[PDB]
Amino acid sequence: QKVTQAQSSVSMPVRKAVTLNCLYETSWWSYYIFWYKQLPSKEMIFLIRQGSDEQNAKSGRYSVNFKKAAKSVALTISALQLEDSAKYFCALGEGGAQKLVFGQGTRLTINPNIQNPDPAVYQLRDSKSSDKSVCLFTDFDSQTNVSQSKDSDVYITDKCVLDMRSMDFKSNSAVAWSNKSDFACANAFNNSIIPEDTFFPSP
Amino acid sequence: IQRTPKIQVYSRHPAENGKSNFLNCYVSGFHPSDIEVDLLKNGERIEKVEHSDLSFSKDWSFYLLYYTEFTPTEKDEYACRVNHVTLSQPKIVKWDRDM
Amino acid sequence: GVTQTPKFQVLKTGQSMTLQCAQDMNHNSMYWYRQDPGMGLRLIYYSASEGTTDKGEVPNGYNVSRLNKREFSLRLESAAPSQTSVYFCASRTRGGTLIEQYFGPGTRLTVTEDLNKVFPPEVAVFEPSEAEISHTQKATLVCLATGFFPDHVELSWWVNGKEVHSGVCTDPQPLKEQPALNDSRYALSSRLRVSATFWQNPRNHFRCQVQFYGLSENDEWTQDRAKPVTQIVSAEAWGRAD
Amino acid sequence: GSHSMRYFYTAMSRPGRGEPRFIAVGYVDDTQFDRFDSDAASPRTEPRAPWIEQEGPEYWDRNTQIFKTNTQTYRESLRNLRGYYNQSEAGSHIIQRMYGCDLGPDGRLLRGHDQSAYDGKDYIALNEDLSSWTAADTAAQITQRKWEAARVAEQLRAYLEGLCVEWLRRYLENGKETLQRADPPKTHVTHHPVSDHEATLRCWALGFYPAEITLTWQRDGEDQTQDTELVETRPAGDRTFQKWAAVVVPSGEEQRYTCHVQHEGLPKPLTLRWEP
Amino acid sequence: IPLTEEAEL
């Protein structure tokens, strides 16, 4: 309630711009607001600071819309790159010696924009004991989401983006695997909204 | 880094025998801040004497006000005893009742 | 800048342990924050200088000491499962406008009721599908790390000796293999995509390296299986033209 | 101009007698409204004027939190200074600093102030533009480089133009019945022969506020300032002040001397003569 | 109101 970020997670196509909300509560006459970005490695890197008696802050691609009266300090990121994918935190620093109360964070996901969609599910062979196998769902566009399968011994990872920079080529992928023998890549993603034109090679 | 204090002994209201008042000792223009000050009623120092919070002027020199409630009589003497590091020996300033 | 050790830790309930923090920047104000899985950061203790320490949004169970200006240590005293979290140290200048706090790498700390829950990862690499290669002229490798606890792992791909990022995607968060159970073990997958041409050269080396963080040598293990020590579990694959 | 706010910080190291001591007082014009002393049992910010006690609890906790932290910062500054000047930790040293904002007759910020001294000498000062500093010596230039890098001038300029002005006004209203009410001085002339030829005329002004006042002895309407003996305006102890001017005059010429008194509390400037 | 935070000399 002291600091509130109304978005839990937001998706955005690359190149565009996004605004992340942050509302706070304070009776202090002097304070600061800070925007941090947390990496998957949990690393906590600093982005931009907004003083209570400062103009709207702008630091490169990061800008802040400070509405002192409404106690709103939304962050805006422009020219969305794919490194921008992270969790963004809004921190109130009231002091004094300012002990930060952090928003609860917003999850920012930058989508790659697939110009040549080609959804397919491939089965990969085990390197060592060549019968255990894993399923790869790849080359679908950023519009498609990936959820779990009804089974208990069937695991499906959240989709993620990789960038073959040496080719200016980006693709989406999702992985599924199981121990059961009656498990086949055929219906690994059956209970998912996958395109009709999804390539299922044989066997 | 050291300058000797200036002393002013006086009362809040114009002196009137038998009428209660306040005896003031005002030390200022001194440095450093360490200083001892007493109010002497006939040579004997007065207890319950208070003083204002430490402060300084445009020139950085400090100033303090010492004071105690008192009833001036035609007979009793009042003086201010002050010791500083710039003073070899304590200075005594007799209260000048006149105006 | 602001260094923090250890970076990973596992604890049995009722254990004491100290996190160390030292800022090389000459700052004056230091903080110890705690971040739960899906939440944000909350202050535990902080200090404006040596000899002085103050609370504290959630100081219970923790003691602290600013032994001097460069160093600020935190203690857990009686480790509790609820104290599982990522502990962040922080440092910052006073005066002027550049008052933002600088965080250390963090300290991922799991507390478990029974150290017999600690398992290393089993790491396997799965070679590119032939259908993929004929359909896209690109080959994706998949590395799979399973059955590990805690979720204290660092995964990296190595190609012909060099650590690689281009064409790599590692799951943002490891997943419970049993989302129902409390101390469930986790799984983490990664992808490395290269050109079919590249993969078709048998002289090319592709290695998946997963650094686990578990017990130390000192630890008194008793159970019959091998001690789940901090280590590196690896799998690999070499080029192939068929 | 018309109104102002000031804070006066004093920090003194005392090797062997404990940790460095920090004292702070706050004035609006010539009325002290709060104090802080670290030597207290459990140090706390305290009111020195009834009108400040309209502030809620949060106010005092907040101020105390700040003066507590100043205590530490200045202890660290005393060390730095000792380093700058290569002095042993055996000697006692003082740091003083006064800062604040001035209001015009119309609530506008006239100018700002911030100055630090070391052992009762000029050390560093924020210039009139509130964006630059004037260092006194080589040591002070070290502080300046850090403060320029840390952007301290910008933090102050924001304060002197922001919070300092808002809150000075806030106090002028909250205590207008004592801060904006001018107390005129009670006056009167005294005469005291020094010999058979000369004599002393002394002009008094008592129970006045603010402390700004102008006592000038005139001979035939001409100011005898260089001949006029003044004393330092002093505290009556009740928040009003006192002062006197004196001149040695020839006997018989007494009537050519007038005493003028200028004060915000006087409708018109007073003119006084000795009236035996 | 005092300066919120003191810079170190």
Same domain, C15 and C67: yes
Q: Do chains B and E touch (3 or more CB pairs under 8 A)?
A: no
| A143 DSSP assignment | T
Solving technique for this entry?
X-ray
> A57, A88, A112: which is the final residue of a domain?
A112
Q: What is the DSSP letter of C215?
A: B
Place of tokens 């129902």: C180
Find the CATH number of the domain harbouring B79: 2.60.40.10
Sign of CA dihedral D43, D47, D52, D57: positive
3-state helix, strand, coil in chain E (%, to 5): 0, 0, 100
A196, amino acid identity: E
Whether D126 and D239 share a structural domain: no
Tokens of B63: 């100033």
In sequence order, which residues have a C-beta less than 8 Å from that of residue A152 and are 6 or more positions away? none
Residues with Cβ within 8 Å of C192's Cβ and at least 6 positions away in sequence, in order, are: C140, C141, C143, C157, C159, C164, C167, C168, C206, C208
C-alpha distances (whole Å) from D166 to each of A11, C67, D5 are 43, 40, 11
The H or E element that residue D148 is part of is helix D138-150
Indicate the number of domains in chain C: 2
Residues in chain C with CB shorter than 8 Å from the CB of E5 are 94-95, 99
CATH number assigned to the domain comprising residue D201:
2.60.40.10
CB atoms within 10 A of CB D231: 16
Q: For every residue of C79-129, which 3-state class applies, written as one string?
A: CCHHHCEEEEEEEECCCCCCCCCEECCCEEEEEECCHHHCECCEEEEEECC
Side chain identity at residue C96, one-letter code = G
D161 and D145 in one domain?
Answer: yes
Whether residues A49 and A101 fall in one domain: yes
Element (H, E) at B9: strand B6-11
Number of domains in chain A: 2
Domain identity same for A20 and A102: yes
For residue A189, what is the DSSP state?
Answer: T
Is there a single domain that holds both residue D134 and residue D163?
Answer: yes
Encoding tokens for residue D161? 């133009």
Helix D163-174 with D152-161: angle, nearest 10 deg = 30
Same domain, C103 and C184: no
Residue D241 has a CB neighbour count (10 Å cut-off) of 23
Give the closest-approach CA distance of D38 to chain E in angstroms.
Answer: 16
Question: The domain spanning residue A2 has which CATH number?
Answer: 2.60.40.10
Contacting residues for D192 by C-beta, under 8 A, at least 6 apart: B98, D199, D200, D202
- In chain C, after which residues is the C-to-N distance over 2.5 Å, breaking the chain? none
Length of chain C, in residues:
242
Give the residue numbers spanning the domain of A170.
113-199
Contacts of D129 (CB under 8 A, 6+ apart): none
Give the pair of three-digit tokens for residue A19.
Answer: 């605004």
- C-to-N gaps above 2.5 Å in chain E, after residues: none
**Which of the other chains make 3 or more beta carbon contacts under 8 angstroms with chain E?**
A, C, D
Same domain, D38 and D175: yes
Domain end marker among D165, D181, D197 = D181
Q: Which residues fall within 8 angstroms of residue E2, CB to CB, at 6 or more apart?
A: D7, D24, D26, D63, D66, D67
Distance CA C24, CA C71 (A): 9
Output DSSP code: residue D20.
P
Q: Which residues of A touch E5 (CB under 8 A)?
A: 95-97
Q: Do D10 and D140 sit in the same domain of this protein?
A: yes
Residues C64 and C91 in one domain: yes
* Phi and psi angles of residue B13, each rounded to the nearest 5 degrees, phi first: -110, 155
The domain in which residue C175 lies consists of: 114-239
CA distances for C207 relative to A40, A130, B9, C119, C162, angstroms: 22, 18, 91, 22, 10
Half-sphere exposure of D147 (CA within 13 A, CB side): 26
Going by their DSSP bridges, the two strands A31-38 and A44-51 should be labelled as antiparallel
Among C94, C113, C132, give the residue marking a domain's end: C113
Whether residues A134 and A191 fall in one domain:
yes
Check whether residue C58 and residue C132 sit in a common domain: no
Q: Establish if B16 touches chain D: CB-CB under 8 angstroms.
A: no
Same structural domain, A91 and A46: yes
Q: Which residues contact D20 (CB under 8 A, 6 or more apart)?
A: D11, D12, D13, D14, D71, D74, D75, D78
A and B make contact (3+ CB pairs below 8 Å): no
Report the C-alpha gap between C76 and D217 in whole angstroms. Answer: 76
Q: Write the DSSP symbol of residue A187.
A: G
Q: Residue count of chain A, please give it.
A: 203
- CA dihedral sign, ordered C210, C211, C214, C217: positive
Residue reference for tokens 């330092």: D232
Range of the domain at D231: 182-272
Closest chain E residue to the Cα of A32, Cα to Cα: E4
**Tokens found for residue C16:** 């004491």
Size of interface A-C (CB pairs under 8 A): 157
Q: How far is CA B63 from CA B35, B57, D39, D95, D147, in A?
A: 10, 8, 19, 16, 30
Are residues A76 and A140 both part of a single domain?
Answer: no
Q: Which of residues 76-135 of C touch D (CB under 8 A)?
A: 93-98
Say whether residue D234 is in contact with chain B using an 8 A CB cutoff.
Answer: yes
The rounded Cα B68 to chain-centroid distance in angstroms is: 10
Chains A and D touch (3+ CB pairs under 8 A): yes
Considering C75, C96, C113, which residue would you say is the last residue of a domain? C113
A6 and A100, same domain (yes or no): yes
Q: Do D7 and E3 touch (CB under 8 A)?
A: yes
